[PDB]
Paper text:
Colony collapse disorder (CCD) is a multi‐faceted syndrome decimating bee populations worldwide, and a group of viruses of the widely distributed Dicistroviridae family have been identified as a causing agent of CCD. This family of viruses employs non‐coding RNA sequences, called internal ribosomal entry sites (IRESs), to precisely exploit the host machinery for viral protein production. The IAPV‐IRES found in the intergenic region of the IAPV virus belongs to the well‐characterized type IV family of viral IRESs. Using cryo‐EM, we comprehensively characterized how the intergenic IRES of IAPV, a virus of the Dicistrovirideae family and a causing agent of the colony collapse disorder (CCD), binds and manipulates ribosomes to redirect them toward the production of viral proteins.
The binary IAPV‐IRES/80S complex populates three major conformations, with limited differences between them. An apical view along the axis of the PKI of a superposition of class 1 versus class 2 shows the IRES displacements are minimal and are followed by the H69 which constantly interacts with the IRES. Apart from the interactions established by the apical loop of the SL‐III with ribosomal protein uL16, the decoding event elicited by the placement of the PKI in the decoding center allows the establishment of an interaction with the 28S rRNA base A3760 (A1913 in E. coli), normally involved in decoding (Demeshkina et al, 2010). This interaction is maintained along the small fluctuations of the 40S, which, locally, are restricted to displacements of a few Angströms. No populations with wide rotations of the small subunit were identified in our large 80S/IAPV‐IRES dataset. This suggests that, in contrast with Cripavirus IRESs (Fernandez et al, 2014; Koh et al, 2014), the IAPV‐IRES is able to restrict the dynamics of the small subunit, channeling it toward a canonical, non‐rotated configuration. The limited dynamics of 40S subunit rotation observed in our large cryo‐EM dataset reflects a solid anchoring of both ribosomal subunits, mediated mainly by the additional contacts contributed by the SL‐III characteristic of Aparavirus IRESs.
Residue numbers in the entry:
A (entry chain Y): 2 to 72
B (entry chain W): 1 to 83
C (entry chain An): 1 to 25
D (entry chain S): 2 to 133
E (entry chain b): 2 to 99
F (entry chain B): 2 to 218
G (entry chain X): 2 to 130
H (entry chain D): 58 to 278
The structure:
RNA sequence: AGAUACCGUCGUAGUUCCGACCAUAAACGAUGCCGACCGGCGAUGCGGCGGCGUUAUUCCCAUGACCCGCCGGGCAGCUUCCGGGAAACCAAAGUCUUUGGGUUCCGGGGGGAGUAUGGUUGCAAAGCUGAAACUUAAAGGAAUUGACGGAAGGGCACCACC
């Protein structure tokens, strides 16, 4: 705390209330931008109909096909 | 050193600086016992008894050992009061 | 890319992005 | 290109501090001593050592040697162990005393003495090295 | 990392010193920043002065000297080998060697 | 040393500290030398108060006497000015000298042949003989120094304020040191002057060894 | 400027301990400093002092021994109950044998232990061990 | 094995003329011998190796990979140390670092939190110790707790016999080089910390270089 | 090879002044500001003091120009186991797990991005405010060893030269 004063609870709380949004985990859980853009939409699971198959190539040094499914 | 009973409960009572009073650690190797030999008023020679003043390592590298040894013998009855 | 000439290329394109919003006024 | 090695120089220095007696100035005198005071499986290594010994045996006769400490260098201190000269700088009756040092003795027991001579202070005080 | 304590220059309470131009190049290097040399030198060095005393009409006329205060930029000072890279402790020596 | 009239600065002693050049100090002042100085002269020279020269050396002799073993008290001089001056102390007192080239690492490194594990050091110049001071601050080794107006009071426990720069000023401040230890141990009496001359301790210039054959020819 | 006298005067004593100075002149002389220094005197961490009277704010020279480890102030002046005092003496003192938090009770300036005996808390001043 | 000692400190130890190494930690005299510890505190001594850390200086062609043994040490009644020795193989450094661990075994001050009755169990103060950016801070605990800490600073506090402790490591504790030394420094600053217990003014009793000087004059030169 | 490049020759706006706009710089000491405290020394800049003499208008003083120090504040310096720090380094970046002298701004892995959008000022260029989706196991700081350099300096060789 840069300010320590005895009547500074309306700057310690208000500054914390502002700088907590710069926390990338907090802002994600408290905006309506991340919550909607989640393909599931605040779900632990989701049923879906398979409408094609994609042999996704492995990213880096491991050369292998990660046989995935479009859902 | 006491427990509630009262007997010495630790395994040694360490040294304590004669100049500053801050204690001397078990591996403060720059520490110094410094004995001064006791001189008779008339003869001007060593008796057998000894006058001891210890300083911690932190004061010798501070440059205030021979300011403090000077005062630990000015008004302890070794060196002149006028000086 | 130099951080100065990246900043200049973002500017030239901001002048372009504005021109493709100006034609609807 | 004949610089002595460490099995020649040190090997010579070990002999001279131990054997100042047996050696001398001439090479052929202390070439043959190295048959007795060294067990060397090399004719060449012997002459290299015994040759460098004589070069150092000419340096105990002109001064001291670096890596030596012998009874002769205990005897070197022994000669001037009680070198007493003629009456020195602490048998003087007219001694140069700085005038502002007359104040630091007047405050003590020693106000005015027998065997001093006072001077006068030097005006135009210019002692410092010019800055630069 | 901060290589030098002074920022390769010799202003500490100014913020702005007007640049005097380079001589080898024409780089706008600041005044304090520039490696400055002041040349004090004979107009004929050592071989020609042997002769010109015989062509001098006057009774042993000593020559005029030639006065050039050089302004080097840092890329020019080290190109012509005026100044020179030094070891991390040798850097801080501000003593000019004769 | 303190208000005893027997260890009072005697009439024979001041005129040695005047004639040697011990009141003659340096031009630069170390901030912890105002406590050993009377007043700054003209020509920028510091008068070392010769009572405050005297008073320190008596306890410095108490210090050497306070060591029961005379052997383990090491005495140090790397500058030529005091190399002989500390060497003549060695035989008389029963001490160990360092008359030029202290090997850095003797007190700490065991397996060096010259392994002095001393109990007390005596130092000519703290700046010049600075190497043992560090090793004296690495084992429990108290430090005595024949200090000056220029020399710092660093890593030294009792300072003896001298002019340790001058040729015949050094050996005189070693002779008074060598006397006072033998006086207290029980060699000399304070009624008669000690037979050994202070000029014995003075380092002879090899330029002036080339002279005396002609000087009294 | 100096906005706490009990802080910047006892910030001056702690630099004289850590260096090892025998006595220290601490320039402001408030009513709070004397009744701080006395509770370090009465408990016997520091030696005796004297307050130099000019026609200003006074000055204080304190005889320090090396018995004082750290003099530590708390700013601002937080109210302390008797059950909340248990938490202050936890995080701000080394052991629960030695070390005192002095605090300004209604009954007067005294250590946490005497405020615990007399059963009256107040605003906090600082600690010393 | 004999150990015919070299140092004046170690010369008195072999003859059973110094009573214990409790004087050695009083006079702060350096134990530069490795058989003074195996003599006294070697009795109930348990030496366990924390880390085996290879380090690679890059050469002209290839790497010179050495090894490092961070060896914890201590009898379970009032002494521990930390020894770090770097050597080219795994058998040398482990054997070598125990010696450097023994040369730097320190006395730990154990005592009492709260009521000062019974056996000494805990650290008697909030000591700190920090090398690198690591900051291991050891607090007195209530009884029968156990050392609530990381695997390693517990492993040294167990060796000390400091049963009750509260640890709060802060900084990059990933590097075990700085994490074993910082916790070691905290239990090296227990007898560097002036408690009101220690105010009974220390009289300077005769040093074993003064006390035994006549033994130290006719055993050698 | 090609240089709407480095090099050269011209040369437009520009550079210059006045009147307005613009409000950004590695605007850096990459270090907010007021206050306290904690080492040393040589310097210097300004003011004031105290202290022999030298020269200056000699016609003695007031007084400069020097000179020894002192004090106040500023610009930096130098050294140090004060202490810190990841280190390089720093009497401040110190007095910080033994954590609170006050107060402002501000940071929260790297990118996306100072981008999108609204708001707002500007004649325009643009400024201040300023996300998110998606993406990724690092980006980075300091230091050490090597390799390397179209870096500097010192060597060795008729597998170099003379």
């Amino acid at each position: 705390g840069k300010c320590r004063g005895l009547r500074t609870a309306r700057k310690l709380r208000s500054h914390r209330r502002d700088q907590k949004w710069h926390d990338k985990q907090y802002k994600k859980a408290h905006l309506g931008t991340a919550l909607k853009a989640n393909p599931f939409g605040g779900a632990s699971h989701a049923k879906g109909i398979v409408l094609e198959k994609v042999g996704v190539e492995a990213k880096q040094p491991n050369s292998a096909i990660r046989k995935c499914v479009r859902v | 050193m006491q427990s509630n009973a009262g007997e010495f409960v630790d395994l040694y009572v360490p040294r304590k600086c004669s100049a500053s009073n801050r204690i001397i650690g078990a591996k403060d190797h720059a520490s110094i016992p410094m004995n001064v030999a006791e001189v008779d008023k008339v003869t001007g020679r060593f008796n057998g008894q000894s006058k001891t003043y210890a300083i911690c390592g932190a004061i010798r590298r501070m440059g205030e050992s021979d300011d403090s040894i000077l005062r630990l013998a000015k008004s302890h009855g070794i060196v002149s009061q006028n000086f | 890319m130099r951080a100065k000439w990246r900043k200049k290329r973002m500017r030239r394109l901001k002048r372009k992005r504005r021109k493709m919003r100006q034609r609807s006024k | 290109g004949r610089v002595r090695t460490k099995t020649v120089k040190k090997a010579a220095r070990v002999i001279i501090e131990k054997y100042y007696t047996r050696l001398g100035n001439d090479f052929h005198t202390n070439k043959r001593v190295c048959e007795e005071i060294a067990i060397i499986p090399s004719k060449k290594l012997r002459n290299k050592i015994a040759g460098y010994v004589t070069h150092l045996m000419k340096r105990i006769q002109r001064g001291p040697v670096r890596g030596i400490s012998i009874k002769l260098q205990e005897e070197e201190r022994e000669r001037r162990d009680n070198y007493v000269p003629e009456v020195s700088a602490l048998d003087q009756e007219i001694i140069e005393v700085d005038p502002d040092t007359k104040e630091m003795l007047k405050l003590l027991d020693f106000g005015s003495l027998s065997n001093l001579q006072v001077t006068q202070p030097t005006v135009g005080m210019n002692f410092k090295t010019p800055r630069g | 990392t901060k290589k030098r304590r002074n920022n390769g220059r010799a202003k500490k309470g100014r913020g702005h010193v007007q640049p005097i131009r380079c001589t080898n190049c024409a780089c706008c290097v600041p005044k304090d920043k520039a490696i400055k040399k002041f040349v004090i030198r004979n107009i004929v060095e050592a071989a020609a002065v042997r002769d010109i005393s015989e062509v001098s009409v006057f009774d042993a006329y000593v020559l005029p000297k030639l006065y050039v205060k050089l302004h080097y930029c840092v890329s020019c000072a080290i190109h012509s080998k005026v100044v020179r890279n030094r070891s991390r402790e040798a850097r801080k020596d501000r003593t000019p060697p004769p | 040393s303190g208000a005893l009239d027997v260890l009072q600065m005697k009439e024979e002693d001041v005129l040695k500290f005047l004639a040697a050049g011990t009141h003659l100090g340096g031009t630069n002042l170390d901030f912890q030398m105002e406590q050993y100085i009377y007043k700054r002269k003209s020509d920028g020279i510091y008068i070392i108060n010769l009572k405050r020269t005297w008073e320190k050396l008596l306890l410095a002799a108490r210090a050497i006497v306070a060591i029961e073993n005379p052997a383990d008290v090491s005495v140090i001089s790397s500058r030529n000015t005091g190399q002989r001056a500390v060497l003549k102390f060695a035989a008389a007192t029963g001490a160990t000298p360092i008359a030029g080239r202290f090997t850095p690492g003797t007190f700490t490194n065991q397996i060096q042949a010259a392994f002095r594990e001393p109990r007390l050091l005596v130092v000519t110049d703290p700046q010049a003989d600075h190497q043992p001071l560090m090793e004296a601050s690495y084992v429990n080794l108290p430090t005595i120094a024949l200090c000056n107006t220029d020399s710092p009071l660093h890593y030294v426990d009792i300072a003896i304020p001298c002019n340790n720069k001058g040729a015949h000023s050094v050996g005189l401040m070693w002779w008074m040191l060598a006397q006072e230890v033998l006086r207290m141990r029980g060699t000399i009496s304070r009624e008669h002057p000690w037979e050994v001359m202070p000029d014995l301790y003075f380092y002879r210039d090899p330029e002036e060894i080339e002279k005396e054959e002609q000087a009294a020819a | 400027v100096r906005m706490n006298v009990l802080a910047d005067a006892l910030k001056s004593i702690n630099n004289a301990e850590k260096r090892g100075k025998r006595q220290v002149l601490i320039r402001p002389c408030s009513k709070v400093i004397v009744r701080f220094l006395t509770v370090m005197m009465k408990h016997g961490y520091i030696g005796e002092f004297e307050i130099i009277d000019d026609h200003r704010a006074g000055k204080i020279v304190v005889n320090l021994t090396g018995r004082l480890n750290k003099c530590g102030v708390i700013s601002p002046r937080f109210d302390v109950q008797l059950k909340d005092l248990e938490k202050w003496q936890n995080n701000l003192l080394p052991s629960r044998q030695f070390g005192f938090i002095v605090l300004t009770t209604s009954a007067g300036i005294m250590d946490h232990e005497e405020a615990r005996r007399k059963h009256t808390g107040g605003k906090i001043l600082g600690f010393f061990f | 094995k004999e150990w015919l000692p070299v140092t004046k400190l170690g010369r008195l130890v072999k003859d059973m003329k110094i009573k214990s190494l409790e004087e050695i930690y009083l006079f702060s005299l350096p134990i530069k011998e490795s058989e003074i510890i195996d003599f006294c505190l070697g009795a109930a001594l348990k030496d366990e190796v924390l880390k085996i850390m290879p380090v690679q200086k890059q050469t002209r062609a290839g790497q010179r990979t050495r090894f490092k043994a961070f060896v914890a040490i201590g009898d379970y009644n009032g002494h521990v140390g930390l020894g770090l020795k770097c050597s080219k193989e795994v058998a040398t450094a482990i054997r070598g670092a125990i010696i450097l661990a023994k040369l730097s075994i320190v006395p730990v001050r154990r005592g009492y939190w709260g009521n000062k009755i019974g056996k000494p169990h805990t650290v008697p103060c909030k000591v700190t110790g920090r090398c690198g950016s690591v900051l291991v801070r050891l607090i007195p605990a209530p009884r029968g707790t156990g050392i609530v800490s990381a695997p390693v600073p517990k492993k040294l506090l167990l060796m000390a016999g400091i049963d009750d402790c509260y640890t709060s490591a802060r900084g990059c504790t990933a590097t075990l080089g700085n994490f074993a030394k910082a916790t070691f420094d905290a239990i090296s600053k227990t007898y560097s910390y002036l408690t009101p217990d220690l105010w009974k003014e220390t009289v300077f009793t005769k040093s074993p270089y003064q006390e035994f000087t006549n033994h130290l004059m006719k055993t050698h030169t």
